[PDB]
Design a protein around this nucleic acid. Structure first.
Ligand code: MG
Ligand code: MG
Ligand code: MG
Ligand code: MG
Ligand code: MG
Ligand code: MG
Ligand code: MG
Ligand code: MG
Ligand code: MG
Ligand code: MG
Ligand code: MG
Ligand code: MG
Ligand code: MG
Ligand code: MG
Ligand code: MG
Ligand code: MG
Ligand code: MG
Ligand code: MG
Ligand code: MG
Ligand code: MG
Ligand code: MG
Ligand code: MG
Ligand code: MG
Ligand code: MG
Ligand code: MG
Ligand code: MG
Ligand code: MG
Ligand code: MG
Ligand code: MG
Ligand code: MG
Ligand code: MG
Ligand code: MG
Ligand code: MG
Ligand code: MG
Ligand code: MG
Ligand code: MG
Ligand code: MG
Ligand code: MG
Ligand code: MG
Ligand code: MG
Ligand code: MG
Ligand code: MG
Ligand code: MG
Ligand code: MG
Ligand code: MG
Ligand code: MG
Ligand code: MG
Ligand code: MG
Ligand code: ZN
Lengths: 75, 159, 104
RNA sequence: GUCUCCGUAGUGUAGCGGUUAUCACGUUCGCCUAACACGCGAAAGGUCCUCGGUUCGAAACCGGGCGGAAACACCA
RNA sequence: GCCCGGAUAGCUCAGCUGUAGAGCAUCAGACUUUUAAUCUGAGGGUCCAGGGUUCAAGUCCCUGUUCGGGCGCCA
RNA sequence: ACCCACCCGACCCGUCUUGAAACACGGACCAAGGAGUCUAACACGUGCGCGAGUCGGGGGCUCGCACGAAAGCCGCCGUGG
RNA sequence: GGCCCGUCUCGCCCGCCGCGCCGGGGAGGUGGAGCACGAGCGCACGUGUUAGGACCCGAAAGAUGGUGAACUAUGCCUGGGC
RNA sequence: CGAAAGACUAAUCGAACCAUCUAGUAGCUGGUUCCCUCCGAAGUUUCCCUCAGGAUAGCUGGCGCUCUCGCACACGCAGUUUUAUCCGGUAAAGCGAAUGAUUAGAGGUCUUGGGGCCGAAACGAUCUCAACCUAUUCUCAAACUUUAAAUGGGUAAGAAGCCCGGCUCGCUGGCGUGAGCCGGGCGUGGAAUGGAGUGCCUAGUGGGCCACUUUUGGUAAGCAGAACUGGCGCUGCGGGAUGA
RNA sequence: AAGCAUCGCGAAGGCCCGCGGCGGGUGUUGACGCGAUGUGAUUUCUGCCCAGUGCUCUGAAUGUCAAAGUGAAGAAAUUCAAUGAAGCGCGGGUAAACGGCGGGAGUAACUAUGACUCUCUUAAGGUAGCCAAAUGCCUCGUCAUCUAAUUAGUGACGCGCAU
RNA sequence: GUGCCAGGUGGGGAGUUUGACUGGGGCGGUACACCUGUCAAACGGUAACGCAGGUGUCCUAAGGCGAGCUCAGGGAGGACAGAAACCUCCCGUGGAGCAGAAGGGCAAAAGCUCGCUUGAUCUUGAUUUUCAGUACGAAUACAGACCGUGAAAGCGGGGCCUCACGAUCCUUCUGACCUUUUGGGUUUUAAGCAGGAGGUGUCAGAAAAGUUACCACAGGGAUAACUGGCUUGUGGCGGCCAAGCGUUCAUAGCGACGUCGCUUUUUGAUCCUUCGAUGUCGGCUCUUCCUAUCAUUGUGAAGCAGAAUUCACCAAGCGUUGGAU
RNA sequence: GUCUACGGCCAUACCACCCUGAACGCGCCCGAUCUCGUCUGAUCUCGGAAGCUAAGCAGGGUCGGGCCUGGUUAGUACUUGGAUGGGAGACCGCCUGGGAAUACCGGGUGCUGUAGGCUU
RNA sequence: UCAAAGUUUAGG
């Protein structure tokens, strides 16, 4: 009593009932499996972003004032 | 039932082409992949360290990691019913920049040129592409000489 | 295979690399008052015949050889197990084979 | 057909990868004897079945060739 | 695995930490008309392998490789 | 809806099976009987009550129980889960 | 990004009735059925999965305790028959 | 118990009968009770003392939720195609290209031979057949190939995109990289179609078979075994007289 | 089945029952007996094989061999040691115990067979007998006989698949 | 002697076991765990007891660096020296070598020869491959230690790449001034925690011999032993071609080397039907059909003088017997 | 025009033989005290600068081989999809789109980056 | 005070 041994006959059909969906792409994928030495350093960089805040805020206010002067000169 | 061995059936795939054996010429090594570079994988026989598996040869995907002398590269591999985006660590020698994306960037650059200009002019320009339309109305001058008649030729047995 | 009797490899205790004496490892005598043996003793007792299985179907014909790497620097002497691939010949310090010589 | 083993001077056999290939008989040549036999002393003789491989090296280890010989071929 | 034994010259075997015994076999001398048989001498031991104890080991010691009679058997 | 006629259609059901009208099995006929239950434990879903709580058991107090072996109440209201 | 427990690596300081092979913290990884302004508890119905006779019917067997030699098997006692 | 046949032991004997344990166990036969409605399979996966069964994926249903907008004011997704761009070593082709096979004559003392004939003998003369070689030539390859299709498989075709300004780093470093952060500035970016996403419970199934084309074993088979799609199984209806 | 032949036992015994007993059967018995096996009247024979598996005999000369007992060290659980019963090994016997019982070459003044020789081999290598038998594959063996005709019957033959 | 322990003996007795796949089973194989080339239909993936093979190891270097070289083969030379010894010049895309099967890869190397070495060491995670996208094994990229080597850039955590291997439980070894050993303390002991080893080859891992013709039960046409289907290799019968035979003459009768068919009175394949049973050989008896015609009727042919004859046509009306084993 | 040093792509760059090379280079070349290394100053290392382009190197040449690129081969071979097309089969023709490979015949025979020379 | 030692034209 020998069987059928293997096949792939009805399988494509079976797969395509429910699509063959592409793998759901997000923005902001994880940093799992990224070269450790990198990840330390981007972690440290992220740690000290709040250091150098007061400088950054002022720079944007100076930029915003320069934009407001430019738009007044245009109008 | 076939053997599950890693390199089964790559007699031809991983085999340097005709009269291109020997030293892996150096541009190959010394060109830079960043994150998110579109990259097509193509295994190579000379370099056996960091070889991709025979399933990812031909396949294109994006770079996610870059180590000292290899590049982590997300590629989509189908499995019966489900496409699995998965991340593989190929050594540079088995990898090129895929040009597929550059022709796109060329077009967007050309669009940004054609958007900046034609704004002060006022005349809006076709930025979208369009498929090859039917080939328009036109005259054909049979200049002096008439058409050439083509009789089909009588059969004969050559061999 | 052949391996030499001295080995300058890592020593955990010291933290460095250090020379170690090498020797092939052996199973010790079997306690008798291990919980296992104490358990089997009081199970296997009485009637019931034999209670746990007995392996009678030997497939392989060689052991993974293990070396017992002992640290040379005193004030440490730290022993360490170090396995090697299976081989039906093994020895320690059995000549250096000699390239480019007459066989007779 | 399967699985097994064996192919070595003329004959029957030994042979643990490095041999002058072992032993007995047979063969030739002396001697002894009147002659023969026995006997004594010497000698000669192997395609190590065939081819290819592994080996620094194969009579052997490994593959196939051509032979030879046992066991199996059952339930209807 | 545990106990025990053998491994010595071609072979079989002695050997009590200070030219390695016996017998056969091997080769040269007698005897033989010669051979065999037998009597004399001569040659031939990595004392299985390695390390130690020891002033000194074939032996004592340990460790292996064998050997081969019993014991034994939880992945 | 009873009977008859005619034209066309139309093999016997059940079942196992890739395949049953089968030269596959079960079945003469009728009546009654006749097979996914209950308990426990888990999980998810749904409905209700209360909600950082919730809970009811077990026990007790109220009755001879007609209805009650119910119903009600408990610094036990929380030992405890 | 952060915090808690396990664990590793590297480091530098604190504490006191008992200065100790005492106790406490830091940085960076990494294991945890974790935390990051709670969602559970009780009751009821449904489906599924199990353990139970467990959808209904079905063995060959296995075990305990009892009944039979009125048939037949063999022995013995006492009679009969050729 | 047996003058032995496994004979006989109350029509029962290769282990009597009665009651109980007992509703013994069964991956195996058989059966399994009203209507309409809606959706609707599988015989393939890996593991299993597994191959008449399970497990696990798959395929089914049920319950939903989260959003979308025909309420003149849409994003995303696809058993397509288009435009770019990689991948390939099958068909074919090739063997005056490698590997291996293989025919023929030309040419060649290449080598050298073994056999000759004429030579004592002599690359002397003359043939010859061996292998080798110089151009040619015949015919081949699932486990050969310089070439090389068709059909085919990736990517890409924008707001998660571009373009400016500045901050953070214990990484990297002549200065710079590269990454991560803030803050602004810019909109339809090929065709065709379609509302999408997402989570829980979950049954049956895990004997298959048939045809086009491709395809292995076999003289072949209504034989055995794969690929590809579509059937039958689950399905009636017109045709093929009859019929999966 | 008679007949033949082995084997155990002198009774605190052989053989056997029984759950147990200063239990029971053989046995109200004693080797011309009880018990266990084979073969199968008579006649005539009963070859060789003790390597194998059995059974049995001997036993400090002795390898291993348990519990207890003896010593040992340890704080003790303990470990280690020496000691050492039967049994295995070691050595004899036994086939009317289970059973077993060969293969090459050459050789005789026609040829053929092979008395004879040579080897290689086992524990021996199948003896007396017997035979295509109720035992022989090839097989419907060959010769004879019996029949007009015989895959049958009988008598002979014997490298006899496989007496 | 009895009582209780100890060791031996013990199919007298008990209980139980006695794989799988498989063109029925058994016998044989292993297609049971792996690897190469092919099968495979130019991504991947794919079957059969398909094809051709390999694996249970080997290596102290055949691992790791760095240096220097160049290999097979051939030509032409040189005392003994010849086809082969050693030296020297030339050519040499690898035709060698790289432990092993094959495939790939490899030349100031991945080959050979030296020098120095232990990266075959210690430790987190990520990933790939089989995949369910679990394990094992095998691999890839990093990261942290401690080293090696090189002037250095670098390379190296085994073997150029694709195979060489093994869970829970138990044991054993190694590891930390580690935890527990429970009323507390000290010490042995044991128990934990973490990593190696002792193996399950039926290789995701029972501990396991037969026989039954005295047999049983659950089932199976998922599967054999008949018929019948398909097929026709094999058997049977028949063409075509025409080298020969036939004194002479291919073809009166024949017919090689080749070739095309039919047939189901042979045997195989196969397993569709039937296992809640289709009575399993032969003979007897009886009927009917077929023709591929032995005889009989009518005819063509001859190597037909007659007689006897074979070859062919129409043709199955009628026949085709008695015995020995 | 051209070279040297380090190159990228790796024959349009290879091989064979032939010719020509001003200047600067690059070489061959002459030595072994020292560095370094050989059986050997051949190579390797080092110190030089008398000769010479003989060679390497460059540029050219050849009805050259080779390679590169077109044609032809050929809408041929093959092939996606189609039919109740043919054919006893084997196979073939059509529709629908895709479409090769030798032999044979042409053409071509390195381009170029950085840094520094020379032809002032 | 006992080893082993077989054979011998047809051709007068
Ligand atoms: Mg199946
Ligand atoms: Mg006991
Ligand atoms: Mg069934
Ligand atoms: Mg069926
Ligand atoms: Mg039906
Ligand atoms: Mg029918
Ligand atoms: Mg039935
Ligand atoms: Mg009926
Ligand atoms: Mg009813
Ligand atoms: Mg709920
Ligand atoms: Mg559930
Ligand atoms: Mg139930
Ligand atoms: Mg029952
Ligand atoms: Mg039972
Ligand atoms: Mg019974
Ligand atoms: Mg029931
Ligand atoms: Mg089953
Ligand atoms: Mg639905
Ligand atoms: Mg292929
Ligand atoms: Mg082809
Ligand atoms: Mg089923
Ligand atoms: Mg079938
Ligand atoms: Mg069905
Ligand atoms: Mg007897
Ligand atoms: Mg005996
Ligand atoms: Mg017998
Ligand atoms: Mg006889
Ligand atoms: Mg008769
Ligand atoms: Mg007779
Ligand atoms: Mg039994
Ligand atoms: Mg089976
Ligand atoms: Mg394909
Ligand atoms: Mg080198
Ligand atoms: Mg190597
Ligand atoms: Mg490292
Ligand atoms: Mg106490
Ligand atoms: Mg019988
Ligand atoms: Mg039978
Ligand atoms: Mg019987
Ligand atoms: Mg059937
Ligand atoms: Mg003729
Ligand atoms: Mg049939
Ligand atoms: Mg009937
Ligand atoms: Mg006719
Ligand atoms: Mg010089
Ligand atoms: Mg020059
Ligand atoms: Mg010149
Ligand atoms: Mg040219
Ligand atoms: Zn140490």
């Amino acid at each position: 009593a020998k069987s059928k041994n293997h096949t792939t006959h009805n399988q494509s059909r079976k797969w395509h009932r429910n699509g063959i969906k592409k793998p759901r792409s997000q923005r902001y994928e994880s940093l799992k499996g990224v070269d450790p030495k990198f990840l330390r350093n981007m972690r440290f960089a992220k740690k000290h972003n709040k250091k150098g805040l007061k400088k950054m805020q002022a720079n944007n206010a100076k930029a915003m004032a320069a934009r407001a002067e430019a738009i007044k000169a245009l109008v | 039932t076939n053997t599950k061995g890693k390199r089964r059936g790559t007699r031809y795939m991983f085999s340097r082409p005709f009269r291109k054996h020997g030293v892996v010429p150096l541009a190959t090594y010394m060109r830079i992949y960043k994150k998110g570079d579109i990259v097509d994988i193509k295994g190579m026989g000379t370099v056996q360290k960091g070889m991709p598996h025979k399933c990812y040869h031909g396949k294109t995907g994006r770079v996610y990691n870059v180590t000292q002398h290899a590049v982590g590269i997300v590629v989509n591999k189908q499995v019966k019913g489900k496409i699995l985006a998965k991340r593989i660590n190929v050594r540079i020698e088995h990898i090129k920049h895929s040009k597929s994306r550059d022709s796109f960037l060329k077009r967007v650059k050309e669009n940004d040129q054609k958007k900046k200009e034609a704004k002060e002019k006022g005349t809006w320009v076709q930025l979208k592409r369009q498929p090859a339309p039917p080939r328009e109305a036109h005259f054909v001058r049979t200049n002096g000489k008439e058409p050439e008649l083509l009789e089909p030729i009588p059969y004969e047995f050559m061999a | 295979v052949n391996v030499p009797k001295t080995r300058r490899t890592f020593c955990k205790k010291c933290g460095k690399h250090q020379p170690h004496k090498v020797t092939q490892y052996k199973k010790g005598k079997d306690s008798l008052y291990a919980q296992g043996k104490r358990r089997y003793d009081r199970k296997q007792s009485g009637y019931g015949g034999q209670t746990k299985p007995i392996f009678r179907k030997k497939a392989k014909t060689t052991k993974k050889i293990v070396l017992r790497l002992e640290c040379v620097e005193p004030n440490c002497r730290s022993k360490r197990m170090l396995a090697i691939k299976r081989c039906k010949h093994f020895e320690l310090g059995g000549d250096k084979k000699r390239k480019g010589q007459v066989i007779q």
